Design a protein around this ligand. Structure first.
Ligand code: NI
Ligand code: NI
Ligand code: NI
Ligand code: NI
Ligand code: NI
Length: 309
């Protein structure tokens, strides 16, 4: 299998967030309606990324069994998307104890991946396995290198067909990319990066971010703006060429509080620069605080959808 061809198949996408990665689906404002897949496919997207919180739906002690009821729900989400001809990225996302206590939670994490790989091993090749969303905290770059290799071994003992998606430590951005090590023996993986630069721009006024109001009225689109973003993407590209790993920008987006123009400029510029590099990508996110589709009103944000598609 050619991971670069798989990365093309992945192509352009959107996160369905604040859904299955909450403690329970619906706790953070989104429930994944089957209808979403028609809406997303009709808009021109190639895939969906489904953040999933397995840790709150599995037993705490060995054999760490994932609940039947939750597996059936995930089946339903995956198959709903596949049915529209969309590719699907599933992950483990918000395993909070793992980030803080990797030494204890490694065993449970790997048992989760054994179960997941086993259940979906015969699913279409348009399903992608993303090991872990944004490794951070006590799960350092070195420890992530250790964990991801063990995850690869566990998954590969079960499934050698599906493409695996591997993120970076220190919250999944470009800072820890140079530290990232993918075993040479693994030949069907895509590296994922989450891009929100400039952070002060994209997160201006972000309520969950400390002192973010200091950045309100921040604009983007200037020409140093463009030089810098191009430079940061050149770094990613270079690493990609040197290591021969395809790239997936699994998350990117600018908060609402950002002005709609600069928002448009930033979004359309990021998109065009990613597509120059043949990178797959997923906008964060479908319908929440960074949402481009209002689910109550059933309307797309036309300006932003145009920037994306
Ligand atoms: Ni349950
Ligand atoms: Ni060391
Ligand atoms: Ni963020
Ligand atoms: Ni500042
Ligand atoms: Ni307009």
């Amino acid at each position: 299998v050619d991971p670069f061809e798989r990365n093309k198949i992945l192509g352009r996408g959107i996160n369905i967030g604040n859904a299955l990665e909450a403690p329970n689906e619906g706790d953070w404002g989104v429930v994944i309606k089957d209808e979403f897949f028609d809406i997303i496919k009709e808009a021109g997207f190639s895939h969906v990324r489904i953040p999933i919180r397995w840790s709150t739906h599995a037993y705490a002690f060995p054999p760490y069994k994932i609940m039947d009821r939750f597996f059936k729900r995930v089946d339903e989400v995956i198959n709903g998307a596949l049915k529209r001809g969309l590719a699907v990225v599933i992950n483990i996302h918000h395993y909070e104890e793992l980030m803080n206590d990797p030494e204890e939670h490694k065993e449970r994490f790997l048992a989760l991946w054994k179960q997941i790989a086993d259940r979906y091993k015969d699913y279409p090749e348009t399903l992608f396995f993303e090991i872990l969303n944004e490794p951070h905290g006590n799960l350092t770059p070195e420890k992530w290198n250790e964990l991801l290799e063990e995850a690869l071994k566990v998954i590969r003992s079960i499934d050698k067909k599906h493409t695996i998606i591997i993120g970076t430590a220190e919250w999944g951005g470009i800072s820890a990319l140079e530290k990232l090590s993918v075993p040479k023996w693994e030949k069907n993986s895509i590296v994922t990066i989450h891009y929100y630069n400039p952070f002060e721009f994209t997160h201006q006024g972000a309520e969950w971010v400390e002192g973010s109001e200091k950045w309100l009225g921040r604009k983007w689109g200037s020409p140093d703006d463009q030089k810098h973003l191009i430079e940061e993407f050149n770094f990613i590209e270079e690493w990609s060429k040197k290591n021969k790993r395809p790239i997936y920008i699994g998350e990117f987006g600018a908060y609402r509080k950002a002005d709609l123009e600069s928002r448009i400029k930033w979004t359309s510029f990021v998109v065009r620069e990613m597509e120059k590099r043949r990178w797959s990508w997923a906008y964060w996110e479908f319908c929440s605080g960074f949402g481009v589709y209002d689910t109550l009103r059933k309307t797309w944000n036309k300006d932003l959808l145009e920037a994306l598609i």
